[PDB]
Amino acid sequence: SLAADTPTACCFSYTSRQIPQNFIAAYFETSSQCSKPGVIFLTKRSRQVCADPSEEWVQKYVSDLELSA
Amino acid sequence: SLAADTPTACCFSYTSRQIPQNFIAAYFETSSQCSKPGVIFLTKRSRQVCADPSEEWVQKYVSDLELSA
Prior knowledge:
The structure is a homodimer.
Chain A: E1 26-28, E2 40-42, H1 56-61
Antiparallel strand pairs in A: 1-2
């Protein structure tokens, strides 16, 4: 567990058209070392699309883990 | 091309034991919006390991694109 991996994922730019729960599947609330507002997603094309802060569609998807974990 | 993707990969912590060109294959010099020194790698386990700034072993691997691109 002490051997973490992966870089610091942070939403520096999201998309205009959202990604509803039809193609989405995973998600992420950015990461520390870069207090980012938007969140990263995981559509079916393994192509994260980022997302505004508290996006109507995200709050529903990220609803699972909304910051608290 | 205007529709970029992926978050801002930045090396916030690298490993002690390096990853020579035996398991390594890809690499990255971090990203902007987070001036990072170390570089991210792509061993065979798709597990980036980051790397000190100008690591003896990296300069050789990252040698291909060393900042200039």
